[PDB]
């Protein structure tokens, strides 16, 4: 089934691999070579997870957990039930995520639009890979990666965090958090502004962009503008994930102690380091 204005868009072309072989749809979904590659990776990966559940002895979604290889194994392979299944599943996940992005690219081409979406999605893939591939490699072992379990991965966040005390003190973590908050703040503001203009007080004509500019200008003395707000939203959310990947990639590789101690460099600056008083004197 198609949207009442869709047919004119379902034309051939745009694929990156396989010419017209996979150039078709299944219901609303577009396929393409990467559409099948995704199905392949997702199917196999889900199958290997189910098998890991079998070996684990549970079908409970709240209990199923696939762990990476113990520190012993370092960066080598490992028996299926002891880290190997996690290694293959990770590959299937990476392959499925990358295929989903490449599939989004064929979709962009068929529709003649920009490539911003798959580009932005790549930041997410890069954050995932940072935890499962990049940091584990710099640290020398797949064991440092997180487990695939609903609650177990939270345990991993907790333990990893306290391994350095209160993780809040990670300076890169602070910046990331700021972007996440600022982002949700901007998202709420954007939706409300547009909506407030499209749905003015009952009985009134739709408001216009000028009204949007006037509302915010009257409110905070500034209006970023329609193009700018979409540029900001993408900026904030991409910067948050980037500083996330950054705050972890440096943890355990170039910084090993309690993060709170890192701040001492500023406190120990020679010109005020020994002045009695305050909190640190």
């Amino acid at each position: 089934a198609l949207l009442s204005f869709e047919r004119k868009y379902r034309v051939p072309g745009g694929t990156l691999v396989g010419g017209n072989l996979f150039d078709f749809w299944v219901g609303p979904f577009y396929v393409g070579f990467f559409g099948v590659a995704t199905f392949f990776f997702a199917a196999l990966g889900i199958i290997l997870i189910a098998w890991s559940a079998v070996l684990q002895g549970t079908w409970n979604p709240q209990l199923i957990s696939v762990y990476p290889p113990a520190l012993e194994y370092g960066l080598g392979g490992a028996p299926l039930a002891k880290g190997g299944l996690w290694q293959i599943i990770t590959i299937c996940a990476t392959g499925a995520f990358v295929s989903w992005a490449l599939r989004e690219v064929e979709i962009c081409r068929k529709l003649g639009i920009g490539y911003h979406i798959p580009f932005a999605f790549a930041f997410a893939i890069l954050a995932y890979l940072t935890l499962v591939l990049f940091r584990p490699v710099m640290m020398g072992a797949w064991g440092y990666a997180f487990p695939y379990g609903i609650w177990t991965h939270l345990d991993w966040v907790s333990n990893t965090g306290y391994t350095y005390g209160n993780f809040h003190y990670n300076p890169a973590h602070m910046i990331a958090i700021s972007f996440f908050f600022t982002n949700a703040l901007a998202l709420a503001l954007h939706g409300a502004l547009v909506l407030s203009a499209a749905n003015p007080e009952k009985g009134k004509e739709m408001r216009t962009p000028d009204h949007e500019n006037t509302f915010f200008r009257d409110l905070v003395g500034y209006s970023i503008g329609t193009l700018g707000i979409h540029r900001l939203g993408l900026l904030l959310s991409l910067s948050a994930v980037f500083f996330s990947a950054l705050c972890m990639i440096i943890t355990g590789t170039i910084w090993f102690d309690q993060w709170v101690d890192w701040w001492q460099w500023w406190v120990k600056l020679p010109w005020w380091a020994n002045i009695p008083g305050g909190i640190n004197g």
Binding site: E6, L187, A188, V194, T214
Partner: protein, 299 residues
Amino acid sequence: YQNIFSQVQVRGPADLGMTEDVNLANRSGVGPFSTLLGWFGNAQLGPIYLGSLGVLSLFSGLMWFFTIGIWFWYQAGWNPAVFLRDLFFFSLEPPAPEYGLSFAAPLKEGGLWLIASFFMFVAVWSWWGRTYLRAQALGMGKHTAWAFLSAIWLWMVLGFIRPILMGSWSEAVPYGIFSHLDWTNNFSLVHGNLFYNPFHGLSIAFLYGSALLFAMHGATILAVSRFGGECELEQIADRGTAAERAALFWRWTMGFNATMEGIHRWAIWMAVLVTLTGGIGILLSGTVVDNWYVWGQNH
């Protein structure tokens, strides 16, 4: 060209905006133009509207800030070098538990915190009234005021509603960079790990989800700016190929899509649910549930 930054900036005379039912007397004059901002968005700063409510809000807001600062200078012994080196370590703490919900705590042991909080209370609420009235004067919907309420709800729960239900100001958050971080960690430790708090998990879902959706929406709009997609209100009133292509990218990708107007409803709720569920998770902590792990065990 990815349209992240403008290739060329264009500028016309200062824009004074719409009048509608706004009292122009309370509107200042245009500010300076920033070429810097102009690369990313609008270069125009101002004008701003400042009626009585606005003056009230700004005054209280400053008194809040200044109160915290004067105490910081005190904690620094009035020494400039100490103020800057320990700036993140200073903290204005609320009254000790011994004082319950009373306003009898000595200035240096809670009173200053309460005074600062009173100013913050007034600042935020009068600013909320302001988000409602500025929209009313322009005949717009009150969506901004409602969304803002959701954030106010988490704020209120943290320093007013929960402390009161708990019986003492000592439960509130201290005014300090690091101290409010220690408070946050301690809060989780004291309530048996907040990861087991269902509402904390949802709140995270919406926080991650807000970055998910804004990255999605921002990238989408930019991807179709080649057809004037940013003119969203214009696309709502008279759908164009920008709105159609945007919708089809997502329909073909994940099997379903939105509309130019509907996507902003998805967005305001995605964001608003962050603090909405968050406020609920914190309010229940220590009043109904002492330990989330334990509570999780019976659910």
